[PDB]
Amino acid sequence: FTYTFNFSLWDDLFNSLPEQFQRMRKEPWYLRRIFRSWRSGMGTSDEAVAYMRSQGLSQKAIDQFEDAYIKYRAH
Amino acid sequence: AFTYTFNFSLWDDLFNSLPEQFQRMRKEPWYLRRIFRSWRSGMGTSDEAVAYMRSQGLSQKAIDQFEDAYIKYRAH
Numbered sequence: 729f730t731y732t733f734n735f736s737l738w739d740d741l742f743n744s745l746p747e748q749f750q751r752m753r754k755e756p757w758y759l760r761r762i763f764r765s766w767r768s769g770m771g772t773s774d775e776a777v778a779y780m781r782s783q784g785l786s787q788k789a790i791d792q793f794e795d796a797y798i799k800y801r802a803h
Numbered sequence: 804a805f806t807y808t809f810n811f812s813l814w815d816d817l818f819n820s821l822p823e824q825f826q827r828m829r830k831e832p833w834y835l836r837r838i839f840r841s842w843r844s845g846m847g848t849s850d851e852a853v854a855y856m857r858s859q860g861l862s863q864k865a866i867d868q869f870e871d872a873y874i875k876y877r878a879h
Contacts, residue, residue: 770813772811772812772813772816773811773816774808774809774810774811777808778808781806781808787831787832787833
């Protein structure tokens with residue numbers, strides 16, 4: 729499974745992802761590792777969103793990571 | 804800009820899923836804000852909001868969290 733994200737140059741400069749999210753965006757094996765753990769632990773969407781907001785992710789970023797996870801479950 | 808993170812469980816998301824317009828408010832902060840600002844302008848009452856949410860099949864847990872979100876929105 730691979731997901732290609734959709735961040736603009738503006739995003740990359742001024743909304744830069746925290747290191748662990750950047751690593752998921754850039755390294756498919758890590759995206760998969762994290763998604764697999766998340767799926768195992770039965771974590772909820774609202775908990776995920778609350779965490780990402782606390783880490784300073786944009787709503788755009790949150791939407792894309794939620795989308796990637798949805799596509800990952802199906803895959 | 805005001806944001807509220809809801810607290811629904813996996814059980815809620817599967818078996819108590821929100822109607823589309825409520826799901827949208829839950830997932831999209833700009834839409835939560837749009838609706839709350841319109842609600843605030845229209846001077847609708849709490850019992851009217853609850854009556855509507857009940858008719859839409861929202862759980863009491865959902866109703867409580869949207870009421871809470873609105874209270875926090877008004878303060879913010």
